[PDB]
Design a protein around this motif. Sequence first.
Motif, short mmCIF file in Angstrom:
data_model
loop_
_atom_site.label_atom_id
_atom_site.label_comp_id
_atom_site.label_asym_id
_atom_site.label_seq_id
_atom_site.Cartn_x
_atom_site.Cartn_y
_atom_site.Cartn_z
N UNK A 29 0.83 -1.20 0.00
CA UNK A 29 0.00 0.00 0.00
C UNK A 29 0.87 1.26 0.00
N UNK A 30 0.39 2.30 -0.68
CA UNK A 30 1.17 3.48 -0.98
C UNK A 30 0.46 4.74 -0.50
N UNK A 31 1.13 5.88 -0.64
CA UNK A 31 0.64 7.11 -0.07
C UNK A 31 0.37 8.27 -1.02
N UNK A 32 1.44 8.94 -1.47
CA UNK A 32 1.40 10.28 -2.05
C UNK A 32 1.76 10.27 -3.53
N UNK A 33 1.13 11.12 -4.33
CA UNK A 33 1.55 11.28 -5.72
C UNK A 33 2.73 12.23 -5.84
N UNK A 34 3.56 11.97 -6.84
CA UNK A 34 4.84 12.61 -7.06
C UNK A 34 4.74 13.64 -8.19
N UNK A 35 5.71 14.56 -8.30
CA UNK A 35 5.63 15.58 -9.36
C UNK A 35 5.97 15.04 -10.74
N UNK A 36 5.12 15.37 -11.72
CA UNK A 36 5.32 15.02 -13.12
C UNK A 36 5.22 16.30 -13.94
N UNK A 37 6.28 16.61 -14.69
CA UNK A 37 6.29 17.75 -15.60
C UNK A 37 6.47 17.34 -17.06
N UNK A 38 6.69 16.05 -17.33
CA UNK A 38 6.91 15.57 -18.68
C UNK A 38 6.53 14.10 -18.73
N UNK A 39 6.35 13.58 -19.94
CA UNK A 39 5.95 12.19 -20.09
C UNK A 39 7.05 11.25 -19.62
N UNK A 40 8.31 11.58 -19.91
CA UNK A 40 9.43 10.74 -19.52
C UNK A 40 9.81 10.94 -18.06
N UNK A 41 9.39 12.05 -17.44
CA UNK A 41 9.47 12.18 -15.99
C UNK A 41 8.95 10.90 -15.35
N UNK A 42 7.89 10.34 -15.94
CA UNK A 42 7.41 9.02 -15.54
C UNK A 42 8.38 7.93 -15.97
N UNK A 43 8.87 8.00 -17.22
CA UNK A 43 9.83 7.01 -17.71
C UNK A 43 11.09 6.96 -16.84
N UNK A 44 11.49 8.10 -16.26
CA UNK A 44 12.77 8.18 -15.58
C UNK A 44 12.74 7.50 -14.21
N UNK A 45 11.66 7.67 -13.45
CA UNK A 45 11.57 7.01 -12.15
C UNK A 45 11.44 5.51 -12.30
N UNK A 46 10.81 5.06 -13.39
CA UNK A 46 10.79 3.65 -13.73
C UNK A 46 12.11 3.24 -14.37
N UNK A 47 12.91 4.22 -14.81
CA UNK A 47 14.22 4.00 -15.43
C UNK A 47 14.09 3.26 -16.76
N UNK A 48 13.30 3.86 -17.67
CA UNK A 48 13.16 3.41 -19.06
C UNK A 48 13.62 4.47 -20.06
N UNK A 49 14.55 4.08 -20.93
CA UNK A 49 14.81 4.88 -22.12
C UNK A 49 13.49 5.28 -22.75
N UNK A 50 13.22 6.59 -22.71
CA UNK A 50 12.02 7.15 -23.31
C UNK A 50 11.76 6.53 -24.67
N UNK A 51 10.54 6.04 -24.85
CA UNK A 51 10.10 5.49 -26.13
C UNK A 51 9.18 6.51 -26.80
N UNK A 52 9.54 6.91 -28.01
CA UNK A 52 8.67 7.76 -28.80
C UNK A 52 7.30 7.10 -28.95
N UNK A 53 6.23 7.89 -29.07
CA UNK A 53 4.92 7.31 -29.41
C UNK A 53 5.00 6.47 -30.68
N UNK A 54 6.02 6.77 -31.50
CA UNK A 54 6.27 6.02 -32.72
C UNK A 54 6.31 4.52 -32.48
N UNK A 55 6.91 4.08 -31.37
CA UNK A 55 7.07 2.66 -31.07
C UNK A 55 6.65 2.36 -29.63
#
Length: 327
Positions: A298-324
């Motif tokens: 179980x979890x608590x608080x939402x974190x700051x997101x200013x960009x789509x890869x801001x999400x990719x970065x905390x998961x630690x994924x090389x940003x994938x273009x919508x292209x693929x």
Amino acid sequence: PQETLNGGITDMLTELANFEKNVSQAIHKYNAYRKAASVIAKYPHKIKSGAEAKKLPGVGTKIAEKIDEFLATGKLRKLEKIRQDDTSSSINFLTRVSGIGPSAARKFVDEGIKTLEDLRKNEDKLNHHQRIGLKYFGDFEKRIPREEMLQMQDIVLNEVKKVDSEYIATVCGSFRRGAESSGDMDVLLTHPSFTSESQPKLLHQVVEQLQKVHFITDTLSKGETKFMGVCQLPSKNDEKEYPHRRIDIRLIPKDQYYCGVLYFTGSDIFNKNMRAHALEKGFTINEYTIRPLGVTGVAGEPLPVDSEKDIFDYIQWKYREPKDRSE
DNA sequence: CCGACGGAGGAGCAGG
DNA sequence: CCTGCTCCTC
DNA sequence: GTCGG
Ligand code: NA
Ligand code: NA
């Protein structure tokens, strides 16, 4: 997997999925058939037995014997029985009208209403959404080529900016992934004056402006945060007029925008795998938020997101273009 | 065998 | 007249 | 209907 590789199996599974969703009202069997149909549509062999496909995640016991019967006979006794059943095949078809789900399609069929002309002869029993869905029954099932989708985006972006230059409007869906065709236009909208605690006619002013320039033709449903309606491109000289298209516009708070932009861009499979590392590495993703775990879970608080890869970065994924982001 | 399987905004009326 | 949940969508 | 407890 080619158009004719396991296409006989997959078409039959999705046909079973539609029957479960529309007639039986079993969304979980419906999602189960769609899942097995999806995982077989990526299986790079022609299946010779039900046990061969049962190895794949999503294919189990009951589907294997359905595959086994299909291979032996080229048909399914039950499925063929469902086709000729007048009341089941009627409930199935009526749900193709936007606004007619499984519950309303049965009511119509039990009181004798079984076709479009039956509905057009019984307008009194249809709500506003269903009257629109009946009116554009042919248009809404047509696909939208990319060239028209980009012309549609031209109007949306042009009119959105001219209401307030601080609106941020992103067209999502398969269109954003470079798809050569779409089924509907999905618009994601936000403004710097709207957060998790925030003169919110913001969606109204945008909807009204596209109505005055005669882009939006009809309204299926309209509220503070979510709009669902119909639009149409202008006709050029004496050429035939374009079909009416489904369009949705959502107002998302500025902090949850790129979570929504990520989610509504897809694909869902691409979200199923991306959703499914986040927890692997201690993050939970939904349509609104990215949230850290959670040693029990179980979890608590939402974190700051200013960009789509801001999400990719905390998961630690090389940003994938919508292209693929097909998966 | 049993519980989970995505879930919320918006439309709308049968019962009394 | 009042109440308040089911349905549909994506 | 299937998977995972
Ligand atoms: Na399996
Ligand atoms: Na429908």
